[PDB]
Amino acid sequence: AKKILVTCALPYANGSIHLGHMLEHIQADVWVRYQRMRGHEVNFICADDAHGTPIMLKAQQLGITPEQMIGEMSQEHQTDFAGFNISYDNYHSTHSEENRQLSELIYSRLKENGFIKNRTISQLYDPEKGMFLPDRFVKGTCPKCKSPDQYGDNCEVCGATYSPTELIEPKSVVSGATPVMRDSEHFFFDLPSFSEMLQAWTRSGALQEQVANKMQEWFESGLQQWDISRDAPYFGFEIPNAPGKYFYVWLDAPIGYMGSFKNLCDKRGDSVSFDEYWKKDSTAELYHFIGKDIVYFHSLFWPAMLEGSNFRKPSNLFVHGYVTVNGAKMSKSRGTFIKASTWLNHFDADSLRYYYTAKLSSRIDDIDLNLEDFVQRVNADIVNKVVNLASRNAGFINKRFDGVLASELADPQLYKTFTDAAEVIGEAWESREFGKAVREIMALADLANRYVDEQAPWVVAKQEGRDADLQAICSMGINLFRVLMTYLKPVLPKLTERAEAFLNTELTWDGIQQPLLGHKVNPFKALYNRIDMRQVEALVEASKEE
Numbered sequence: 001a002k003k004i005l006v007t008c009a010l011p012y013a014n015g016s017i018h019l020g021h022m023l024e025h026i027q028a029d030v031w032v033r034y035q036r037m038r039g040h041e042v043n044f045i046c047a048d049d050a051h052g053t054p055i056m057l058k059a060q061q062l063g064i065t066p067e068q069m070i071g072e073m074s075q076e077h078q079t080d081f082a083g084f085n086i087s088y089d090n091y092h093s094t095h096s097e098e099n100r101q102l103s104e105l106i107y108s109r110l111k112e113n114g115f116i117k118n119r120t121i122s123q124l125y126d127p128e129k130g131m132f133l134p135d136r137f138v139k140g141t142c143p144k145c146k147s148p149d150q151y152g153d154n155c156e157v158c159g160a161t162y163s164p165t166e167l168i169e170p171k172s173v174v175s176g177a178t179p180v181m182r183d184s185e186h187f188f189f190d191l192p193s194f195s196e197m198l199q200a201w202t203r204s205g206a207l208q209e210q211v212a213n214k215m216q217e218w219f220e221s222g223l224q225q226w227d228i229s230r231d232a233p234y235f236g237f238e239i240p241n242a243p244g245k246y247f248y249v250w251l252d253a254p255i256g257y258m259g260s261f262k263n264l265c266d267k268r269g270d271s272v273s274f275d276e277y278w279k280k281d282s283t284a285e286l287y288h289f290i291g292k293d294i295v296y297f298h299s300l301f302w303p304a305m306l307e308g309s310n311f312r313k314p315s316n317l318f319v320h321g322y323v324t325v326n327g328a329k330m331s332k333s334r335g336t337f338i339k340a341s342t343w344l345n346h347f348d349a350d351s352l353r354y355y356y357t358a359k360l361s362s363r364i365d366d367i368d369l370n371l372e373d374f375v376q377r378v379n380a381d382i383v384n385k386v387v388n389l390a391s392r393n394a395g396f397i398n399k400r401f402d403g404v405l406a407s408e409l410a411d412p413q414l415y416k417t418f419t420d421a422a423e424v425i426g427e428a429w430e431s432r433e434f435g436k437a438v439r440e441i442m443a444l445a446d447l448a449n450r451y452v453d454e455q456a457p458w459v460v461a462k463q464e465g466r467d468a469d470l471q472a473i474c475s476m477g478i479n480l481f482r483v484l485m486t487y488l489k490p491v492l493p494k495l496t497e498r499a500e501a502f503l504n505t506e507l508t509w510d511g512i513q514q515p516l517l518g519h520k521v522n523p524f525k526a527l528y529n530r531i532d533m534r535q536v537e538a539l540v541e542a543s544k545e546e
């Protein structure tokens with residue numbers, strides 16, 4: 001039994017979960033549920049990324065403590081993920097005692113190992129508010145076209161880019177006062193020192209081809225030292241021995257993966273698993289599911305930090321692309337910027353889980369949610385191919401045979417074709433070739449429905465003395481359904497629970513080898529209903545209104 005620790009990127013605490021986040025959490029959950037079905041020890045870990053200036057300032061605007069604000073967002077995030085049945089073993093926070101101790105520990109080891117450098121920098125400073133200003137909190141007039149009210153390092157009118165120090169008549173977005181250049185000592189992590197170690201990992205062949213290719217571009221550009229400190233005022237962890245200095249969010253953020261796991265172990269009263277998973281000699285596997293925008297961070301900075309602090313590194317990084325709706329980036333004006341909570345007001349979790357899974361692969365390509373296609377695919381595959389197998393046969397069994405399935409398989413050869421596919425389908429789930437697994441499963445679903453069509457139960461049912469044949473045909477269809485729902489169990493948790501209640505049995509991967517014979521099933525009300533474009537229209541309109 002393998003020991004596996006799987007994570008999803010930690011969501012920022014200052015924004016609601018949207019369909020973009022869901023692609024990642026659903027992809028990981030499918031993989032995690034499959035690994036659990038194969039008997040491995042799995043720890044699915046996540047948490048909110050709760051530190052930083054943006055958060056501190058938002059809390060101040062709302063007139064509440066950052067602690068209260070992140071606490072509310074944490075609850076909101078978990079409610080949404082729970083609604084999509086993302087099976088985390090623990091969901092913690094980067095703002096925790098566990099993360100504080102681990103951040104201090106790692107920093108101390110990096111400093112002791114000579115990987116921390118002191119450097120003085122110059123940055124825009126708000127003298128009224130009394131704080132250094134990140135680029136996005138500095139506004140002014142574009143140096144090129146002279147357009148007013150531009151933010152950060154770029155102009156939204158002429159498209160020019162520049163240092164905020166070039167803005168004409170600069171103004172603090174926080175207080176409106178004119179910012180000035182101010183010096184401050186910062187602490188940098190010497191990432192360049194790990195260049196050779198990182199280059200070796202890149203060419204090892206573990207990472208996705210597209211990722212390794214990207215990394216070569218970054219090595220070509222040249223690794224730089226990374227600033228891991230921030231001056232007060234700040235919402236985060238104070239740096240030991242450095243009054244007024246805090247750990248920059250990106251230093252403590254990934255350590256949150258560790259903090260969340262330590263929290264889980266501590267709550268379980270488990271005093272050995274943390275070290276067994278994070279020590280350099282660990283035989284456990286560590287996987288991070290992440291999006292394209294944070295690959296540089298997880299593939300270079302993170303492994304380097306772990307190495308420098310004597311901890312094991314990721315076994316692999318699983319990168320997915322962006323989510324688009326109707327072919328384009330989510331658009332608020334078009335109502336395609338959809339929140340996870342909003343989605344659930346209109347559709348169930350299984351529908352989106354299935355759709356995403358049917359399009360996912362082991363590559364980093366973008367995933368498109370075409371709403372028209374969504375309706376067609378769900379109705380065609382879930383309702384008409386898979387659920388149909390149960391709904392078209394269950395009635396006769398319950399009404400004509402007291403809910404009892406036949407004592408033998410009507411077509412053992414066909415059943416073997418279904419069980420024989422477990423190896424390829426499981427390997428598809430394992431390798432993250434989700435689209436391939438779904439295609440294979442639906443191909444079997446087509447074969448199953450062809451079988452039922454060929455036997456014509458609707459004809460046999462009205463013909464005198466054909467009771468035995470009817471029970472045989474319908475029981476065969478239900479057993480094929482049993483196998484299909486087993487392969488789809490990691491994808492559709494809710495439909496699976498309903499299927500298990502109907503079948504009177506928990507679905508296990510190895511269980512398909514023993515078909516249900518002389519077995520009692522229960523009656524069921526709509527296992528899964530059709531959806532329509534009117535619902536999609538409502539979702540879009542509701543999203544526009546938000």
Ligand SMILES: N[C@@H](CCSC(F)(F)F)C(=O)O
Nearest residue numbers: 009010011012049253254294
């Ligand atoms: N909050 C970040 C992800 C943090 S993953 C970590 F490892 F950096 F914690 C984002 O949403 O992009």
Ligand SMILES: [Zn+2]
Nearest residue numbers: 142145155158
């Ligand atoms: Zn301009």
